[PDB]
Enzyme design. Structure first.
Site, PDB file in Angstrom:
ATOM      1  N   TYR A  77      29.720  22.013  68.701  1.00  0.00           N
ATOM      2  CA  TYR A  77      28.636  21.991  69.681  1.00  0.00           C
ATOM      3  C   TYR A  77      28.133  23.401  70.011  1.00  0.00           C
ATOM      4  O   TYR A  77      28.858  24.401  69.864  1.00  0.00           O
ATOM      5  CB  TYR A  77      29.087  21.252  70.941  1.00  0.00           C
ATOM      6  CG  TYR A  77      27.976  20.434  71.584  1.00  0.00           C
ATOM      7  CD1 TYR A  77      27.680  19.121  71.142  1.00  0.00           C
ATOM      8  CD2 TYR A  77      27.229  20.965  72.643  1.00  0.00           C
ATOM      9  CE1 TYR A  77      26.691  18.344  71.758  1.00  0.00           C
ATOM     10  CE2 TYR A  77      26.226  20.213  73.270  1.00  0.00           C
ATOM     11  CZ  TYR A  77      25.957  18.920  72.825  1.00  0.00           C
ATOM     12  OH  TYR A  77      24.947  18.229  73.445  1.00  0.00           O
ATOM     13  N   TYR A 120      23.975  15.777  76.723  1.00  0.00           N
ATOM     14  CA  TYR A 120      22.636  15.180  76.637  1.00  0.00           C
ATOM     15  C   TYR A 120      22.134  14.671  77.980  1.00  0.00           C
ATOM     16  O   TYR A 120      20.959  14.863  78.332  1.00  0.00           O
ATOM     17  CB  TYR A 120      22.646  14.014  75.659  1.00  0.00           C
ATOM     18  CG  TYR A 120      22.705  14.472  74.241  1.00  0.00           C
ATOM     19  CD1 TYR A 120      21.780  15.394  73.772  1.00  0.00           C
ATOM     20  CD2 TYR A 120      23.701  14.021  73.390  1.00  0.00           C
ATOM     21  CE1 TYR A 120      21.807  15.831  72.480  1.00  0.00           C
ATOM     22  CE2 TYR A 120      23.760  14.453  72.079  1.00  0.00           C
ATOM     23  CZ  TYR A 120      22.812  15.355  71.625  1.00  0.00           C
ATOM     24  OH  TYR A 120      22.816  15.796  70.319  1.00  0.00           O
ATOM     25  N   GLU A 174      24.300  17.816  65.345  1.00  0.00           N
ATOM     26  CA  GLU A 174      24.521  16.414  64.954  1.00  0.00           C
ATOM     27  C   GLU A 174      24.253  16.209  63.481  1.00  0.00           C
ATOM     28  O   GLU A 174      24.809  15.293  62.868  1.00  0.00           O
ATOM     29  CB  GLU A 174      23.628  15.458  65.792  1.00  0.00           C
ATOM     30  CG  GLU A 174      23.697  15.619  67.322  1.00  0.00           C
ATOM     31  CD  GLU A 174      25.005  15.128  67.992  1.00  0.00           C
ATOM     32  OE1 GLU A 174      25.965  14.738  67.257  1.00  0.00           O
ATOM     33  OE2 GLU A 174      25.070  15.157  69.269  1.00  0.00           O
ATOM     34  N   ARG A 177      27.498  17.047  61.945  1.00  0.00           N
ATOM     35  CA  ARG A 177      28.561  16.059  62.192  1.00  0.00           C
ATOM     36  C   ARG A 177      28.368  14.765  61.402  1.00  0.00           C
ATOM     37  O   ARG A 177      29.340  14.061  61.142  1.00  0.00           O
ATOM     38  CB  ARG A 177      28.626  15.674  63.672  1.00  0.00           C
ATOM     39  CG  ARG A 177      29.034  16.753  64.652  1.00  0.00           C
ATOM     40  CD  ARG A 177      28.747  16.263  66.067  1.00  0.00           C
ATOM     41  NE  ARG A 177      29.351  17.095  67.102  1.00  0.00           N
ATOM     42  CZ  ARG A 177      29.119  16.937  68.400  1.00  0.00           C
ATOM     43  NH1 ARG A 177      28.305  15.971  68.812  1.00  0.00           N
ATOM     44  NH2 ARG A 177      29.705  17.729  69.288  1.00  0.00           N
TER      45      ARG A 177
END
Ligand code: ZJT
Length: 258
Positions: A77, A120, A174, A177
């Site tokens: 992150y 988020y 993301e 990931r």
């Protein structure tokens, strides 16, 4: 003396150049990863030496502005970024994480810690928009890069900064990931389109932590209890085993096995 740096530019970006970028990001994230099982597991936070803890992603655009995101190798992150002579960090959750980020951008004159975290729910509140209504693509990424830079000059207000983080986090963190989300971005670059993520993408993002647990706690690949995901049309289904997710999830946060 510096953490690994990966470079990407929206200027003339292609499917190929974005694929190279995400492949390099995954490569740096997994230098210390456990690759013995079906899906790579990111390094464990506990005992990880500070010199292996972060990677840097340096972004530029057609305006040749540049910003540098810092990524935590333990969860992929974004923890903060640098623009010019200033660095900005999300509120850390605990003291150890606050200490670790003092090792980032140690030469900048001005260091700031935001009052808010980078999850988020919070960023969407600050942006005044849900992920469902924030377009992704090369165009949005280009605009996000300028917005992040001009935050340091006073030219970007916080709601636009938050929307810019939402764009960067999805298209870098993301996409690293999830092969599935990387493919969603690849299609946008391919057809030169900008569009908001469908429910399958949003539910995968929300589920990354739960999936990481279900997978690393599986027995013979079988989940203890199902986890529910969504198709692009919003319909729901269950997954019960690791194998079907091998093509979908590329990296997992470390989780304990009993
Ligand atoms: O839109 C569709 O038809 C589909 C959307 C997704 C599918 S299928 C999927 C199937 C099995 C998994 F383990 C994970 C996913 C990710 C989301």
């Amino acid at each position: 003396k510096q953490y690994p740096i990966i470079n990407f530019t929206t200027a003339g970006a292609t499917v190929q150049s974005y694929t190279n970028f995400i492949r390099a990001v995954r490569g740096r994230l997994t230098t210390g990863a456990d690759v013995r099982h079906e899906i790579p597991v990111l390094p464990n936070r506990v005992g990880l030496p500070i010199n292996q803890r972060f990677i840097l992603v340096e972004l530029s655009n057609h305006a040749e502005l540049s910003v540098t995101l810092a990524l935590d190798v333990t969860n992929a992150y974004v923890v903060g970024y640098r623009a010019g002579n200033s660095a900005y960090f999300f509120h850390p959750d605990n003291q150890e994480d606050a200490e670790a980020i003092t090792h980032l951008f140690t030469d900048v004159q001005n260091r700031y810690t935001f009052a808010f975290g980078g999850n988020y729910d919070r960023l969407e509140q600050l942006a005044g928009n849900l992920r469902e209504n924030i377009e992704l693509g090369n165009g949005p990424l280009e605009e996000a890069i300028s917005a992040l830079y001009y935050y340091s000059t006073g030219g970007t207000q916080l709601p636009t900064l938050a929307r810019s983080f939402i764009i960067c986090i999805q298209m870098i963190s993301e996409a690293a990931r999830f092969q599935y989300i990387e493919g969603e971005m690849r299609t946008r670059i391919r057809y030169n389109r900008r569009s908001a993520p469908d429910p399958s993408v949003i539910t995968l993002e929300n589920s990354w932590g739960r999936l990481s647990t279900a997978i690393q706690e599986s027995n013979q690949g079988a989940f203890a209890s199902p986890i529910q995901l969504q198709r692009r049309n919003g319909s729901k289904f269950s997954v019960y085993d690791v194998s079907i997710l091998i093509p979908i999830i590329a990296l997992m946060v470390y989780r304990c096995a009993p």
